[PDB]
Amino acid sequence: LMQFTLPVRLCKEIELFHFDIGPFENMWPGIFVYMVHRSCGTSCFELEKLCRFIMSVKKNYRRVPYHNWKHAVTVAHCMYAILQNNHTLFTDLERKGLLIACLCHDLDHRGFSNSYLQKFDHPLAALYSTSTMEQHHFSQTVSILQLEGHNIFSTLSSSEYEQVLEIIRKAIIATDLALYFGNRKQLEEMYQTGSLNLNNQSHRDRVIGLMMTACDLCSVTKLWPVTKLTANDIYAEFWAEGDEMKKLGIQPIPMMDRDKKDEVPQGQLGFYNAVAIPCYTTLTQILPPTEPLLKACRDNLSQWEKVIRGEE
Ligand SMILES: CCOC(=O)c1ncn(-c2cccc(Oc3cccc(-n4cnc(C(=O)OCC)c4C)c3)c2)c1C
Numbered sequence: 001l002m003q004f005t006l007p008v009r010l011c012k013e014i015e016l017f018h019f020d021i022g023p024f025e026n027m028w029p030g031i032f033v034y035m036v037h038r039s040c041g042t043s044c045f046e047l048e049k050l051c052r053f054i055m056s057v058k059k060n061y062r063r064v065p066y067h068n069w070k071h072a073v074t075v076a077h078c079m080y081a082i083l084q085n086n087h088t089l090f091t092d093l094e095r096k097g098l099l100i101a102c103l104c105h106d107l108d109h110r111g112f113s114n115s116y117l118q119k120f121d122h123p124l125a126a127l128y129s130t131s132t133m134e135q136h137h138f139s140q141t142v143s144i145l146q147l148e149g150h151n152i153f154s155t156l157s158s159s160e161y162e163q164v165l166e167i168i169r170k171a172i173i174a175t176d177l178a179l180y181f182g183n184r185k186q187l188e189e190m191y192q193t194g195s196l197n198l199n200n201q202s203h204r205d206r207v208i209g210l211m212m213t214a215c216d217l218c219s220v221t222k223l224w225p226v227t228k229l230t231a232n233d234i235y236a237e238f239w240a241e242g243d244e245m246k247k248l249g250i251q252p253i254p255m256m257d258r259d260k261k262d263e264v265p266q267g268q269l270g271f272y273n274a275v276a277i278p279c280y281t282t283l284t285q286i287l288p289p290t291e292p293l294l295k296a297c298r299d300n301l302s303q304w305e306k307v308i309r310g311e312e
Pocket residue numbers: 177219220230231234254255256257260261263264266267268269270271274275
């Protein structure tokens with residue numbers, strides 16, 4: 001009989017795709033609990049275990065400029081919006097798994113790409129040859145679930161448990177944006193040829209993968225001041241990586257070269273055209289009620305075009 005509630009402006013705005021979770025770090029756990037309770041029910045997780053899990057998840061995000069705890073909770077909130085706008089398309093196990101997958105999807109990120117790990121010769125790049133950080137993030141998720149009093153999935157059968165951990169693994173692996181391009185091409189073709197079948201688990205897998213990319217990129221779907229200030233955070237990481245590439249004797253790609261600051265506007269255009277727009281385009285085709293993510297992304301592309309024209 002303990003319903004989590006938010007102040008009125010949050011209670012209403014949290015249901016919208018463009019909600020920003022705000023700069024009050026200590027409200028993020030309650031925002032997440034509010035979302036699980038509304039998306040899943042007060043019954044899906046024992047509150048004391050969920051609280052302990054969220055707090056260990058928080059502790060295992062690092063204080064990097066972008067791939068931090070705020071990103072975790074932001075990506076969960078977009079997933080919550082998709083789930084609440086497409087109620088009857090998702091299983092009970094999918095609703096439980098996917099908000100958790102989003103909270104956990106960047107666990108123990110260090111602010112460097114899979115590439116940099118591979119060029120540095122980091123031990124994780126020997127353990128996990130592809131989707132290096134993303135296998136690490138799942139591995140950290142499983143480690144936190146196995147802490148005493150942290151198994152939020154305790155109530156599930158042996159079957160359901162294997163099923164949810166497999167939804168989470170695939171969800172997290174899909175956030176490897178190298179995998180996005182092929183996934184979306186396949187989903188586009190299936191949607192157009194009419195072969196797309198949500199009863200085919202393999203198809204559901206691809207659709208959940210696209211939702212994961214959509215949630216992961218959701219900074220591009222926010223109010224322009226959120227979008228622009230978040231871009232400054234992600235380039236802070238990208239340029240520190242470029243600095244590290246130069247320290248290994250490697251000229252970085254332009255996106256990671258702080259000497260090519262000037263070129264950010266045009267690089268955002270490429271990003272919106274090559275990744276973001278197509279991502280939310282295909283998502284809106286498959287799940288019509290996600291359309292506000294596409295429309296917001298398009299709006300933000302047009303703000304980046306204005307930056308380029310010196311109209312800001
Ligand atoms: C918080 C906002 O999230 C982002 O901004 C974001 N999130 C992921 N990615 C990303 C990761 C890997 C490849 C990629 O894919 C693309 C695709 C097409 C263009 C680009 N691109 C972006 N900037 C430059 C650049 O040179 O800036 C110069 C400083 C270039 C080339 C990145 C895009 C970006 C840019």
